[PDB]
Amino acid sequence: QDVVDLDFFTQEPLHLVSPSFLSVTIDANLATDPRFLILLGSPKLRTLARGLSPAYLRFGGTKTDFLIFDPKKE
């Protein structure tokens, strides 16, 4: 009918994932937004990000290969 029986395998784990299994990105293009410093300062955004700790934050994307570090830039 609409009742489904489940089989479980619990003898030993098939795999171990990282404690950071569910991780997140910020696209490299965001660093071209002139508001970048202000946006990442948002208290709301920090609160939401902390909810996902532990996690990796990967900063990358297509613009990864079109961004240059300028150590003289203000």
Partner 1 sequence: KFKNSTYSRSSVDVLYTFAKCSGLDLIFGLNALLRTSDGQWNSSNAQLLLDYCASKGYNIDWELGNEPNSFRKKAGIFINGSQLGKDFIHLHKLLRKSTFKNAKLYGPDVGQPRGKTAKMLKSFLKAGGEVIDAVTWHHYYLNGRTATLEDFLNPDVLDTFISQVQKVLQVVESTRPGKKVWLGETSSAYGGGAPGLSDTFAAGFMWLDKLGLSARMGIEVVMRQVFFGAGNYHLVDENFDPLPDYWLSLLFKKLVGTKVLMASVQGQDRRKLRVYLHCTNTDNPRYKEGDLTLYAINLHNVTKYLRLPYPFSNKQVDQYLLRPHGPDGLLSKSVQLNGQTLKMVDDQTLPPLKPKPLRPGSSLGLPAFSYAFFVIRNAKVPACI
Q: Which residues are annotated as a binding site?
A: 27-29, 62
Q: How many CA atoms lie within 13 A of 60 on its CB side?
A: 5
Residues with Cβ within 8 Å of 58's Cβ and at least 6 positions away in sequence, in order, are: 23, 24, 25, 26
Touching partner 1, residues 4-33 (CB under 8 A): 4-32
Annotated binding site for heparan sulfate group: 27-29, 62
Instruction: Give the shortest CB-34-to-partner 1 separation in angstroms.
Output: 11
CA distances from 63 to 5, 16, 20, 72 (A): 48, 33, 25, 21
- Tokens coding 53: 């700790």
Please report, as residue ranges, which positions from 29 to 68 form the binding site for partner 1 (by CB under 8 A): 29-32, 36-37, 39-68
CB of 62 to partner 1, least distance (A): 6
Q: Which residues bind partner 1 (CB under 8 A)?
A: 2-32, 36-37, 39-71, 73-74
